[model samples]
Every structure is written in structure tokens, then in C-alpha cells.
Target chain A: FKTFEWPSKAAGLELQNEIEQFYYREAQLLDHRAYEAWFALLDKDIHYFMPLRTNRMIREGELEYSGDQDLAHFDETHETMYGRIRKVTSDVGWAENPPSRTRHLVSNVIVKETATPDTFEVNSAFILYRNRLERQVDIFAGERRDVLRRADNNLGFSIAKRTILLDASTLLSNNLSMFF
Target chain B: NWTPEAIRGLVDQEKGLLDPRIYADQSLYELELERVFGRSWLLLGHESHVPETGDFLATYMGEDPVVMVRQKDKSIKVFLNQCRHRGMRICRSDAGNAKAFTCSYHGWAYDIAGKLVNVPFEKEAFFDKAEWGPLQARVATYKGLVFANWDVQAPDLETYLGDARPYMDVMLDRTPAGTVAIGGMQKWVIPCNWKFAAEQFCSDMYHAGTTTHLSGILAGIPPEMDLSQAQIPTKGNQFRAAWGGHGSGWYVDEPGSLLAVMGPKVTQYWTEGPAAELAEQRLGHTGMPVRRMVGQHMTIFPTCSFLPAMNQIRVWHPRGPNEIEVWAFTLVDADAPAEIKEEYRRHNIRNFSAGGVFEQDDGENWVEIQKGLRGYKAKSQPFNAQMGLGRSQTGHPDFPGNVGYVYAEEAARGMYHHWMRMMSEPSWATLKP
Candidate 1:
């Protein structure tokens, strides 16, 4: 049977408080449509990926999610991320022209120290609620595994890597125009 | 309640008028599932998906779930996923190698060929397994694409494809090695009629030159490139299949659109490099300018669609009258260099996948149109599909079938014409071309 690993020691209370504040502020920036500000919080070599999920037999758990070499909904780098941000903010981007009113809810935060200095592995669950036009609404629930690196900037942390795992084997939304 | 005469009145190809009710009426949707989807050769998946014996992929034929399995002899079989005992699904997994599928609801079991082999009380109480297997469909393969048809009397895939085959070959037969599907299938839902997506891919190159994808094009270009130089070429042609609803359109002698969507690396491989030269040599005999045709879009009959240079192949699976599920994937030449294949995968993700900038724009328009159809007044009138009504010609120097200007809807009219025929006629004697 497969099992999950737990850290021997949790982050100190003060550090935990700081990390939680960082996540909340990050969510606020995204919800406010400050895409450029959100971009600034990512490291230059950031790897943002979301694998395609599939239904499989119970004994074939490892094959449920597409692997690194397989096709994914999102397999992006810092440069491509900027391009996406540029498009959504443009006047002619119809998908976001009306602008989706989004609320990024973050919870179940767990932080652990990494071997690399000033780097930490963070796990969190999210529920993103998006409403657009009149009655169109979509709620996306997923878990994110991220590597948060300490930065010298005002944000104190930058996302070096993020791997998102969505719950649905078949996506229910029309499109995934918003960030996770 | 739709008789043949009444159904024929819904679409007037000569005048390019289409009844908007066709996109919203519930009873009409039921007839489509029987007349159009049931008879059409629907694309299932690539051969590579189930290479080994017993490997299978679960997919939909219209709205009915079916499983495509590879036999021990390497031939493939497609059967309804339902178990005959109680109508439960025989296979529940999206894809995998299975020795035999056992109904999750009961103990009924079937072999890879869909032959019922076991039932929970067969030995003592029941013994009708031989006559209770699920229905099977006729299967065929064009190049590497696998298609299945439920109608035994319908024309074969090649004959049905007709003039559209050569255009499809531009993507599928670029190399002697054929094509291989890259990555996993990306599926997403869109609230719209399937025709909206199908007809656009079959005929509408006009949208690309308009404001529809301008933002995506601008975002995809090099940061230092002059914004003024970004332009969609006007020199191109659209193809309407001689008989079937299949259609294709492309910009000729222009690599700008291709470059914008796929970036420079793919553009060079498709047009300038040794790879491009080889493709030209392999396909030049057909007389079509295979090397320079950019941003080519095609739909084989009902729902199979692809962008050749961009390498995104997909099927718009109709969920109902007002919704569709798009199952898309990327394809590359099997012998393509590692980096080129990687580039194709990455670029397709950026431009056509669920999160793709270009794809997002397309879904928004479809969903909004579907929403508009909710009003009683919206379905009262006909939508104008007339772009190049009488301007189409046949026997072009390099093209086949009914060829028209790039920015035209002649192909859309052709698509609806065939759709009307399928909905009206019930026999292959009159329907087969």
C-alpha cells in the first residue's frame, strides 16, 4: 500500500502565520485581476504544470494522472505565462473582455522546510469561483503542490514550481481562462 | 414529427439561410442522433492509443458510450459499452489494458471482442450468453485515424471522405511514417450546437482575419516584432467536398498565421527546413501547394476537425441540442525530431488546449450564442450564412471539388446540404454518392 510522508517538525507559529498571510495576499492579487503583480511573485525559472486526469482501475492508481511526458491542460514556463497575461489584459481578448468576477479560496495550508536554504514545500487546496456575463458560473476545486522560495522582494516569497491536480476526470467548465 | 419534406425546408443552401431552431429544438436533436451521428463515420481515436492486445479506450459515439479494443491479431473492435444483462457499463475506465471487462454493476463478463463469456448464475439458472452480447460497429482506418460507423448500409470511410482525403493527407501523410498522437486527450465542455464548431472549422477562415483571434495572435508574436507587420493573408481557398459534408479551408502562400499560432520553430519545420522540403517532395505531386498552405482547418463530415500546421485534431461530441464536449489532442509526424515534436506539443497547449488563449475565445462565443437561444424570439428567424453564395467554382488548377475564396461560407452551405440529406433520406440507395 502507498502512504504519504509527514514532516517530523512543523513550521514555527510565527513562520506559519507569515506564510498564511502571503497566500491570502496572493489570492487577493489574483482575484483583483492584478495579473502583472501576480507575475512578479513567480521566480524566473518557474514551472507551472497541470496534468490531465483520467479514470482508471483501482489497482492502477499511478496511471490516473498523465505523466511528465504526456499531454496536460497546462505545461507552462515564465515566458508563456507572461504571454497569457498579456492576452487576457488585451482589449480584444473576448474570453476575458467582460472579465470574470473570480474569488480564489485557499485553505488546508501545510508548509515544510526543504534541503535547499530558504526554500520550502507547500501544499494547499483551492476552490476558485468564477462568474461571468449573467448566469454563467463555474467552481473549480483542486490541490496544489508548490515550491516556495524566499525572495528579497517585498512579497518575501516567490513560486518556483507549482503542480496543480484537479479533482474532475472530465472538466466541467467551458474553458480554463483563470489561474489556479 | 419532422417529416422529410419539413426537414428539407429548414436549410436553403442556395440562399444560405439556416433556421436557428435547428440549434435549439429538442426533438430535432433526437433525430440527429439517429440520422446524422448514427450513420456518419465518427472518429474514435488513433491506433497508437491501443497498440497492444486487450488495450482499450472508452469513448462516445454521439451520446452512447463505446469501447475500442485491440485484438490479439492487432485488428481493432468497437462495441457498445453496455452489459446486456442489466444495461450497465461494461468498462468504466477511460483507457487501459484489460483482460476482460466485468460489469461493475453485476458479474457479467465479456472478452476483448465484446463476446459475452460469463454471467453470475449461468451454470444453474441462465445460459443465454451466446445471444446476449452488446452490438458492434463497423470500423475503418484512414491513415492512422480510427473511425467507427453504426450503420451497416452507409458508404465506407474512404468513399465518404472523397475529395476531403487529399486535404486530410496534408496532415496525416506528411511523412511516410504517418502521424502519432502526442500527449493525452484534452476534453472540455462547451454549451453550443456541434454545428457551430464543425462549420467554423470546415469553412470559416474569415474569423481569423477579424477581431476574433487578434489578441491571441498579438500575444503569440515575438516581443520585438513590429506590430504593424502582423497581417492575415487574403490569398487562400476553401474546399467543399463533392458529396459528403466534409470541408476544408486554408491560407495559401502565407506562413504568417501559422507562425503566429505555432511560433517560429514549428513554422520553420513546416515551411523552411529540411523537414519542409521532404514534405513538399512527398506531397507536391498532388499539385496542391502543401508547403505554403498555412492555418489550414478541416472537418470530416460531422465532427472530426483539425488544424494542419498547428497539429490540433479534435472531435466535437454532441451532448444535446445545446451542448458539446470537445475531445482534442496534438499530433506530430512519427519521425519528427524530438525537439520538433516537443515544440508541437507545447505550442498546441499554448494555442488550442483548454487553457489556450485562442481556444478560450472560441468557447466564449459559442456559449454566449447558446445562451441567446434560450429566448423565445431568438429562434423565430433564420441566420444568414451567405458569404460567397454563388461565387464558388470547381476544377481549380491546384485544388479539387467546390473551391471558393478563403473568406466564404460555401463550405458551410455544403455541410448543411449534406446534413439535410441525412436527416431527410432513410436509405443508402438515395443517400450514397
Candidate 2:
């Protein structure tokens, strides 16, 4: 009860329903692994990230900062993200040759109005569930904050930028695959 | 105990080292398992891997499954990944944050610190909930690098890391601010015995000359580093100071002169950004401080090997006698700019994986060596440990060659000597360095 599954809303109740449906359509594309189609949703300057959040006890928010999963970060652009995908799809990147089975759970969608009439901000919760044949179940859950821009001609949501803020300061997992 | 005459009959008198046959013997393996692995403190992981409150990471020592997690209180603890309820593995993932671990087989649950929180059918059934909870295993950390030993009698990690401490400092200090973080682990599956992997580093510049040329041709890249040149120092090649017990601090008779053989152009390419960051960026997050992650090749006895120059640490954890799962993890300076760290990670992965251009060259021969040695029935089997044997010297006033010596073959010699010390007597900390 303390936390929400989808808390994103731009305006009032009527707009909220429209926003929920937007997420629904978006999830379907990603769940089907239609990465090419999903890329069409982004603006050129996409700031997608997975920052390291740790648990420490300093001042207000400082003490909870545990920097464990701080190494080997991915500051990927669209091309680089596609390149990583290509490695797995290629004959060379053997780590994912067999491919790990995966399931992504995205919930708690929230939205905020931006200064521009064409633009809006969105926030949501996500949980990525995975089980490689070799490794058992692994779930990565966090808060995702996004910036969405409406196109004049196109009808769908155009993501200007997306930043994924993960909670673990020191990360435990290996190679990161798929957008959380 | 067998007398010298009987022992000599069983061993190769000319080899002067343990018989190659010992590498694959099941009885010998069992003895090693009970003695070496069980007695020493295994490095589970660095605290850098789990920086948050609910963070947890899992790895294995030999065949044992271990999980290291940061508690709500910010202290990290490591325990067997197995659940105490039905003895089933509790959590199975590379890593993630969780409020508590609950057995999938049953409804038993345990908190981050391994405290049993709740159980199914507890008050309703024959369950003293507290008595039926999961158990807590011993977890130890040395300077932020976590280690766990199932054996209760094994000496604590600090005592166990003896002699290797100074070298560890020098090996880690190359990073900025004298601290290094656990970079992402990039592992490879090599088709060879574990020892060949470490033994290859034991002063074997002999294999690099012809091998590098052949490998260079296959990869279609020009040869860098004529390791052949390293086999014999040119007229000017000089030995740097041996810090009495800190192992030997080595530099080229001229550091740059030797580096040039890697090809002036390529060495130039490597050092511009990657090598410059070596002396700069330091990773401070991982509780332990690693001062030098470059300029040295450090061999910590038993399995792990450190080559800070490559920013690589490899574990030669043995599998049976002829097989081992080689796990290589790269470390990066915490202070390096993002682009530089990325470049380092990219270079490291491409150089070491099974299909890697350079690693396969090293892998193929190691497999061939292990296969050749599988011929234990031959009466005239001979393996060489004689390189720099006569020239190897001790008694450096300030350096660590006091208890042992450092030559190309010194590591191989030291490895077996330490192995023998454990096999023959109890692995008490009392054993000499």
C-alpha cells in the first residue's frame, strides 16, 4: 500500500487513462523484443543510464549510498546499444550465444507536465526478471524517469530522454542486457 | 612418512619438482582439497561489488557456492548460497537487491544478514520458528576484499595473505588515490588444466617468441612485444630492487626500452590513455585500497594471479586435475575518465576470451602441454624447471627474496614449495614464509 505499481499521470483522471494505455502499447513492443520499433520512440539526445546507488549512513541521502555496483558502467547511445545487441546476435559474443530467457515487469507509471506544450515527463517502476539456462532467476527492479515529447506529425510518444535510476550502489550481476 | 630413498624412487630425481603425474592423481587431488583449499582463506569477492544496503553477489571457491550481501546496517556478510531449510540453493541470480531470501521449494525465509525471519506452518505445525531458521556462516573481509572459509580451523585472512601483502599494495597502488574497485568480471573457458594457466606465467618467456609470431600471423596483426627479447636481457638489462620480502620490484633495465618491443607505435597507442590512467585514477569505493594496478606482475600463491599492467586478475580454480574453470576479472582505476575506463574494459575482454585473438594462442599450447603430460606411463618423462635456476639468487637486503627467491621460475618453485609445505604438515600460520 505504501508503494504504487503505476503512478504516472500528466493531468487529471481522463489524461491518466490515456497515459496508462500509452505504457501498455509500449510494453507490448518491448516484450515482443521489437527493439527496432522501440528505437523509433526515442529523440536523438537520449540520456539512458543505469547509475550505481549504494547504502550508507551519512547525511540525509548520503549514508544510503553504497557504491558496490559502480564498476563497468554502460553510458550507451542508440548506436552503441545496438552494437551491444549485435555482439550477442553475432557469432562472436558467446556469453549470450544460447541467450538467457528473460521477462520484464514495468509498473507504477507516473507523469508530470513540462514547460513545453509538446513535451511531458514520465516516471515509473520496473522489474526485469531473467533466468539464463546456466544461471537461475535474477530480477533487477528500479525507478525509471523519462522525458517524452509529442511530435507534430507523428501520433505516438517520442521519448526525448530516459534515465534509469537503479537502487543498488554496488552491483552484483554480470553483463547487462536489455533496457530495464 | 616415506624415507628419501623411497620418495626419490616415486619421484623424478632429475626434475627435482613434484612428479607431473601428481597433477592428475585423484588421491593427490583429494589431499589438495583437504589441505590447500580447505586450509587457506579463499577470496570470495571485493566489497566494491555490493555498495548498497540490500546488495548481494554470489561466487564459488572451488565448487562451493557463496553469497556476499550488504546488510541493512551497511555491514557486508557472506554465506553459503544454499538454504538451510531443504538444503536447496536459496537465491539464484548473478545479483540483485532483496528484502529477504525465501526458499522456492518451501516458505522458509531469511533476512539479508541470514536471520531466519519466518517459516510456513510454524505455529500451526511442529515448528519452533526460531529453532527451524536458516544458519549463519562465517564471513571475513580483508581490506574490502571478502573471503569465506568453511573450515573453522583455517587461519584468519590477514594471516593467510602474509608475504603477499606488500605486493598486493604495489599491485593495487598504480590506480589513482591508491584504491581500486572490482571492475566487471570477464571470464573465459580454457581447454586446459588449471596449473598450466598459472604455470604459464611462472617465468615462461620461453614460449612467447615463436608463439607470438605464429599468433600474430593468425590474428593478421603485427607482432608486439617480442617476448623472446625478455628471455635474455640485452647487455643493459638490469634487475630492479627486490624489497626483501615484498617480492621483486621490476622495471626494464629501462622500462620504456622493453615497452618499445611491443612496437613503438602500439605501445604508444596503449599508453596514451590506458597506461596514463594507470598512475592516476584510484577506486576508493571497494573498502580495501589497491595502490598499484599497473607496472607489476604479482602471483599470490595457490590460484589467483595478478597482472596489473593488463588490469587483470585471474583465478586458476582447479576442476578435477586436467580441467579448470578459468575466471578472469579486470580491475579499473576508480578515478579514470569514463572513456578511458571503457577503452580498458574493451581491450581486456578482447585479449582474454576463448575466441580472443591473443588468449587462444596461450590456451592451445597449455592444452597441448597438459595432454602431453597425460602420458604418465613413460619411464623417461622430463619437464623443465631449470630456467634461471642457477642464476636465481636470494638475500636482497630490502626486498622479499629473503624467504623465497624471484626468477622467471621462482613462482613455479615457490608455488610447489608452498604446496609441499601444506601437504607435508598442518597448514598452521607457523610455516615459514
Candidate 3:
């Protein structure tokens, strides 16, 4: 609902490169299972969410998403997100106790400046693969809309918001332990 | 390949032990399609899901697809999703408000009430449209939960709910505003028998404090959080319906028991204040049990299960003997404070969503047990379902239906007893209430 479309002109290459590098590093930290480091990249007030997607006829209207806050796959505040990270990294989160191997691939980066002083709106496509134990493999494909803000200090950027729109309506995997 | 006698042998009421074949055999699965799912009243969704006229939510009964739609009269209509022509789905969307549903294969269209109203080339390509609409099932509502049945002779929803209604009222009728499902339904497939999921929910609190969920509980505690302050539940009771296959288990006076599993704010909202008082007035009279019954887990026979304080309701849709498609939703009081309702929505996801900490433990146990059942020796063995087998008693001083201990397999035995009855009886006269 937040006006997602191809803009008239793209951001300059220098700014784009900075955003792309930021995402690639973030993906690396995620895949390497460096949850604490990844958690640090989030703004104190970050809003991370993944609402359920629906396959509908165009007659049902334009949005590919059901857009109901009443229903979502993931809707987390900074505290809950931190709680989730703490659970997974504590070596006691049974869902990922053995630690599933994952590859978070980020590409198709696009960026635009936001009205907020230190923040920018960014969109990027991602394909995340998770392999846990024997014979179990799962893949998630989606586009993410993220709001990134330059840290008040010189420590680079923080993700203020992230909304992952998954391509599949019904998830096949046993659990969604890996973040997108 | 299995006869009624053979299927009857799968469940032994005298010994309270059941064969693993009931969980994995193919022939029994085929029979279940007709006998179990074909006849039982299946929970489709909530009335709030399709509140407006012409709103429809597409879902499945067993493996057979169906659509639950709100009609112009404000009543609900449930029909098979397959088109009469070529068997393509009439509506592909999971949910939406619509005037008509049209098959993608052909242009055959049906009204919101599932009447075959239009078909492309109707004048030349087809005969009378009246005879070709998709099959309709009997639709009914309990509290706010909508249920559908394919069998014409199945008992009415009231008779089906029976005394189980009081326990259900704990979650549903807490406030005059009733309950509203929060968040869209969360779905995922678990490679395990549907019974494992349903039965555990029906009667298993033994697993919660045991080795199975200990890790999950430990992870949720803060790194420096004081254990002395946590109100972990050490006492509770379980219920098995006197007649129907309904069952429930709840912790007494311990909000922190579930507060540890789900967050604190949501647990406080569920166990205290005006809504809790109203819930007690409606659900608790003799024992004052409903208000104290926190983190309740329950099943309404077959596939429906809901956790009261956790606020999660789901149907364990049987995909096969080896798998189940979990369609789940979280509910909050319609009149609850905005923050409380939001807490309900958020806490449920963290506790029961596809990747939820507690939910992960449940699925892993079922999946592992199912994996073991695939072996020759494992399939030949019988499961020890005898816990508290002979201790069941009805007309408890406080409770309405049959009652049992908190961590007992009595409900599991009752569930199998009724399952065998439905499977072998073969007639509505014997099966229906």
C-alpha cells in the first residue's frame, strides 16, 4: 500500500553502491549465523514484518497482498526481534539448535531518499536457501522494502524498517527460523 | 484391503493401546476419507473471517477443497471448490469479497450463494445450469467459529458441541463482543499424522514440562532473568468429553506458566481485568476454574484444536497418513483494548507461528515419531496409550463433561475410541447424536 512502483529516475550509482554493499554484508552475517552482529544493525525502533501473500484474480483488485495487519507471517518490533535472535543464538532454540546452513542472496537493489533527514527507502529482491540436517532443503524468494538510516555516529547504517513480501502463499518448510 | 473387523482391531479399548497402522496405513487412510472426514463437522474458519455479505474464504475439508462464503442473507454457504465443468477451482483466492466465482478453466460462474448463475456459451454449450453447481455442504456456526460438513445426515452443531461448549466458551464468549480472528491464517505442512497433532493438543501437557519443550522454555527466559519470580505452572487438570471426542487441559491459577511461553503483556490481558471477569462469569460458576485455567490446549474431535490463553486456533488438515497441512489463526476479544488485542496478535505468532519456539518442539516430536513408524518393527508395535485409562469420570462437582488428570492419555484413548466407532459403525443412525 506504500506506493511501490518503478520510479521515474533511479538513484545515482555511488549511493546505489553503498546500499548494495550494506545489503550484501547483512546477508553474509545472516548466512554465517552471526545473529548478534546482525541484530546490532537494526534501529531501536525497527519494524520488521512479513505479511501473507495471496493469489487472486485481477478482478479482486490491484494489490497482490491481502494487506490485513490482522494477518501476517512476521510482525516484530525491536524487542521481539531481539528476543528471537537471543532465542536462536542461545544454542537452546530447538528449531535451529543444530544450526541450519543458510545462504541469503540479495540483489536487484533500488534506492530513493526519504523525507526523514538520515533515512532512505530501498527495495531489493532476495532468494534465501536453508539446508538443515539430512535431506531437508527449503528456499524462500521475496522482495524486501527496507528503510535504512545513517547511524547518528560514524558506525554506518541501521535498518529502520523491513517488510518481506514472500512469493509463496503456503510455506513448505517445517519452520521459518532464518530471517529474510 | 482392510475390513471393518481389521480396522476395529487397530484400536483396543480394553488395553488402551493402539496399533501404529492407524497412523500410517494406506487402506485405513482411504477409509478415513469417507468415514472420518466425510462425516464429521469440520471447522472452516471464523464468522468474522467472512463477516460481510459475498465475502469468501477458500479452504479444505480433509484434502478436498471447499469454499466458505457469506451470502446476501448474511447466512454462510460452503461448497466444494471444484468447478462442475472440468473440475477446475471456481475461486482461487484464499479470501476476498466477491459477487461471483468463475472457473478459470471455462467461464462457468456461480453466485455468492454457490448457485450456478452463468456459463459461457450457455445457450449452445450446456444443458440446464441448475443441475451443475458444485456440491454444497451443511454450514453451521458455534460461538463465532464456522463449521462445515459434507454429510447431509450429520448431527446439528449444538448436539455436536454438547457439554464441550462450556470449555469452548472460555476462549470464545469471554466478552460480549465475542472473539475476532487476528492476523491472516498461517499455514505449513508437518510430516506427521494428523492424530499426533490433534491428540497432543487434546490431552498432552506431559510434553510441555518434559525434555521435549525444556530447551524452548529455557531459551525464552532472559539472559539475566530471575527464575524465582516466574510463576511456572505445577498444577493442572485435563478434560475428556463424556460422549464426543472433545478434550482439554489447563493450568490452574498460573498466568506465568504461559506468560513464560507467550509474552507477559498478552498473558496479563488474557488472565486479568474486565474481559477475564466477564469470562469467569460466563464460563466459571461452581469451580471458578475458567479464570485460573491459563495456557489451555484443547481439541474438538478429529482435527480442530485451540489454545485458550495462547489465543491460537487451527485445523490439522490431513494431507495423508504421513502428513498434515496446518491452517492456523490467532483470535482476540473483539472488544478488547487496542493494545491488548495487538498483544494477542503478536504473542500468538511468537508462540505458535510456523517458526514459533514452542510450535517447533511440537512438530519435531510428531515428525520424529512418524519417521520411526515407517520401519517394519516400528509399524508392528503398539503405542502405550494407557495413561489414566480407567480413571475417567463424568459429572465432576464443577466441570460439565467427563474429567481426567492434567497429564493423562485418557483423551487420547477416548479420541481413538470415537475414531474407531465412526470408522466401523458406517451409519448416521449409529454415528450421529
Candidate 4:
């Protein structure tokens, strides 16, 4: 837990700026549903995780996305993602045939101080809203935590860890089709 | 082209297979939203979900957004999600337990009972606080279920549950302590027409053996019986498609014997201790609390289906003409042990989700149904629901069928019959509870 005053050095700050561009480009890929290009951003040993929501005791806040076992809706691993991508991209997947219209707004990027140099942490708040037919709309607002690496301002995020904190516990709407 | 008389006459002639126009027409869909979904009694929320007072549940009454909440006195109440002030929705969350609700825009606060308790800065703002609180609609609760109607003079909930009440009571009575708890819910989205999904559970019993090929493959049980063979199974498994706009296509007539043999090994998986025991009681028919209704896989018409054996109650709600949202809640005896209850919850999710075994099978057929109706050939054809035509025996003592007893197309015919009745009129006020 530390604070940074202008990233300590010029090279480090330049690296931070490059990493920010990588995030914006990824956002563009997700919004466009470019499966292959989005897949390219992943580290070979990447960990894709999601956990189920459960009834919480009186004061226990939300648990992490990595621990809960009763995943109401999810998929893990790149292979699983590929299978899913194949289905939605295939002729038979009805839900996505008339693909949903979405807008992913990512902003307020920040870098958290970490114990290791290459293991830098980044945070950004995001809002994902999907517009379906007529008046139905689905909204997902959350924060993403990412661990990354940078050198000579050429940023490439690495395989340490990531977490997403969703604001709402009781989802009052339809199924989440687009990733937030 | 459909009149109640025409629909009834078609079924009478043993030819209620249905016209494709019924599925693809907007006027017909409008008629259903108003008449069928309007005048008929609908499911709101179960008692178990809103256990404590002030706990509110939100959902749709046809296309109308509604909210039902338990009151401070433990009595359940319901209301239009619309606020009286410019129709702004007061509570914004999907659901929560709160002593009061306030509109975000104007900051008008309302109590749990929908009372306009406070208006911030009204004294300084310009208007009188007393005159500007909020107004509510007629709310009612029956048998732990809650309902609200915009019609000030509408009949009570008990009257609307009519004809279906006796059987519902029997299922209720069989609940070891005489009640049903929502084991929890597993919501899913199916991309197909609303009617396609709503009518599947009831009428598609004919598809149990054929349509279930994939499910059987997954479950490792060979899909058996070609329902088109019309080879009705009698002694142990019997066909019980009834009338009254409700019917069960695949009902295993004898239960105790099946469970005694199948329960331990079936791996039906999702039963908790108490619910499992209740499942045993529901299956073990030393005799049912009410005998006639036992051994039936009944549909409660229009949208809800009850699989007493599967221990599920599902509703097919129309999001639009081509899309439907499936909200399913498993039934559990409130008194059941936690572990067994959890099992029932798991089993339910596995069987009915977007990826569920049974739901996935049903979804493909529904999409096909929606797709085929849009086909040029299907639309031009007069359509044939002639199976068991003229054989739907009338005056059968137990259920809703008075015509063709064939499992295929009967429930859809019943739905269209109601649809015609609904389409013929504008104001459902005349058909009130």
C-alpha cells in the first residue's frame, strides 16, 4: 500500500501512459466483439475467473469473484471462452443472432503501488449498458483491478491477478450477455 | 380469423392444431396481452421469497411492471411499480427490505405500506406537503401469494384462483406442513417467441420422448417412445391432458411404486432433507392428501406449469413477440432440512437454466416453432391439429379437456381458445375476478 508522486521516474511514467492506451484499445475490441483481437491481449497463463452470488450473512459484504462456487452464470479458461465464442458466432445461437447493442464506458484509470516493479496494479471504473429491442436496457457498473508490467513506456499487462467489484447484489433485470 | 366460437368449434371438430396466424400476428399478440394475460389470475411471487415484512418483490403482470411487498403487520401487499407522481418509479433497486422508499428526482419519501410519509422541504419549496404525498392501487394477498389490480373494482385474488384452487390446495395440503417454499430461483433467457416457450411445457409432453433426444443423450438415458405413435401408456404411465384451459400431457399414473424403485438411484439430485421427504410423500401414494390431482403433470394455463414430481413451478413471461424470459422457482417445504433443500435447489438449476437439460431441449423446439411460423409455406398452410381429432372425450371428471384427448397440440389449442376470447374484446373489465 503506497502512493506515487508522478511515478518516481520519467521512464516509469511513460510506461504508465502506454498501458493506458492498451486499456482503451481493449475497450474498443470488446465493444466491437472482436473475438480474435480480444483474445490476443491475454497472457498465455492468464486466469479468467468469476464466482457465484449467494445469500450473505447480516454484515458480510460481497465476496470475491474468485471464490464463490455457485456461479449462476459463467465460464472459465480460454478453451471455454473459445467454445462460447464459437457458439455465439455460429448460425444456431439465437440470443446473439440479433446481437445486443452495447456501450462500454471505461474511465478514471489509476495505478496502485505494489511490492514488485513489474507487478504494477491498475484500476479503472467501467459502465456497460446493453440496449435490446424497444425499451429494455441492462446495466453493469464495476471496477476492474489489474496487475501489469511496463518498460521504456511500452506497456504489456501480465499474469499476476485481477478482480472486478460489481455494485449491485440483487440483479433486477435479464441475463448478462455481454461481458462487463 | 379466430373467434372463441371458432376455436371452440375447431377443438369440437377434433381439429384444434392451430393456425400459424395466431403466432405471427401483432393484433393477436395485443389481444393476448390484454385479454388472456389481463383477466386471468397470474403468478406474482411466492411466500417464502418475501419471508419478512417490508420485503418487496418486483415482476411483470403481463407487460405491466408490478411490485409486491410484505407489510409491517406481516400481511403481503402489492402495487403498480408506477409512482402516482408523473408515474416515476419510487423504488429503484431490483429488490430490498426497506422501511420506506423515496423517489430520487423529487426526494419524496414513502413508507413500506406505500404511504406518503414525508416530503422534503415542501414548506420551503412552494406546495403543501400534505397534498403531495403519493397514492396507491388496490392490493390483495391470498394463500401467501400477492396481487394488485389497476381496476378499482376488480374481484379479489381468491376468486381469480377459481377452478384451479382445489388442485392448488391439494398440492399445498401435501406439503408436509401444508405449504410451498420457493427453493430459490434460476432465471434464464431463451431467444424465441413468448408463446413458443409458455405453451411448450404443457403441450410438448408429446415431445417428451422425441424432443428429449439430446437430453437423454446427456443424461445417458436412451430417449424412448415415439409420441406420434399415439400409443398411449395406461397402467403405470397414463395420458392426462385435461380441459379448463389446463392439462398435463405426460403424467405417470402410479407414483409410490416408481419412487420406491427410482428415488434412491435416480440422482434427481436437488432435493434437500425436508423437501426430499416431501418429494417422497408426493411420490409415495399410500394415497395423496387429495387423490384425484395426484399423478398429474399439470399446467395452470396461459403461462405457468407445475411438475409436481420435478418439484418445479415455471412461468414463461413475454418480453416481446420474439423474446421470452424464463423465471423458474423450485418448490420446497419450508420445514425441510437445509441440506436436502440445497439439493432441490441444485437439481432445479441443472434442469431448467439456459444451459439446463430440459430447458435447452425445449428452447431449440421453441426457436424452431418461431422460425417455422415465419416460413412462407407454414403461413400459407391452413394448419392441421387433427391428431385424436373428435376424440377429445367430453365430461371427463377431473380436468380441463372436453375435446381431443391427444397430447399433441391440445394445450396450444386451449391457449388459442383463450386468445380468441381475449382478442374479441377491448376491455377486460367485463371479465373481472
Candidate 1 or 4, higher DockQ?
Answer: 1
> Candidate 4 chain B: minimum summed lDDT over ten consecutive residues — where?
B218-227
Candidate DockQ values, in order, are 0.80, 0.04, 0.51, 0.08
Give the docking tier of candidate 2.
incorrect
Give the top-scoring candidate (DockQ). 1
- Shift in Å, residue B163, candidate 3: 2.0
Find the 10 residues in a row with the least total lDDT in model 1 chain B: B223-232
Q: Write the per-residue lDDT of candidate 2 for residues A47-70, one digit (tens) a residue.
A: 555443433223224423223333
TM-score of chain A of each: 0.95, 0.76, 0.91, 0.73
Question: Judged by TM-score, which candidate is best?
Answer: 1
Q: Candidate 3, which segments miss by more than 4 Å at Cα?
A: A1-14, A66-68, A116-118, A151-155, B119-128, B218-223, B226-231, B284-288
Instruction: Give per-model TM-scores.
Output: 0.98, 0.59, 0.93, 0.63
Across B163-206, the per-residue lDDT of candidate 4 in tens digits comes to: 44544543454454644554334455655666655565555555
Model 2 chain A lDDT-worst window of ten:
A63-72
Docking verdict class for candidate 1: medium
Fraction of true inter-chain Cα contacts (below 8 Å) kept per model? 0.74, 0.03, 0.50, 0.03
lDDT-sorted candidate list, best first: 1, 3, 4, 2
Candidates arranged by DockQ, highest first: 1, 3, 4, 2
**Per-residue lDDT of B147-186 in model 1, one digit per residue for the tens?**
9999989989989998788898889888788888885899
Per-residue lDDT tens digits for candidate 3, residues A1-180, read 445775678888888888898888888888898888888988888888888766666776554564545667788888778667766776546677778899988888888887798689898899999998776788989899999998743236789999988888788987887888
- lDDT tens readout by residue for model 2, B201-310: 54343443233323322222223433234333222111211211112223333334223222233334334556444533443322221221213455555666655555
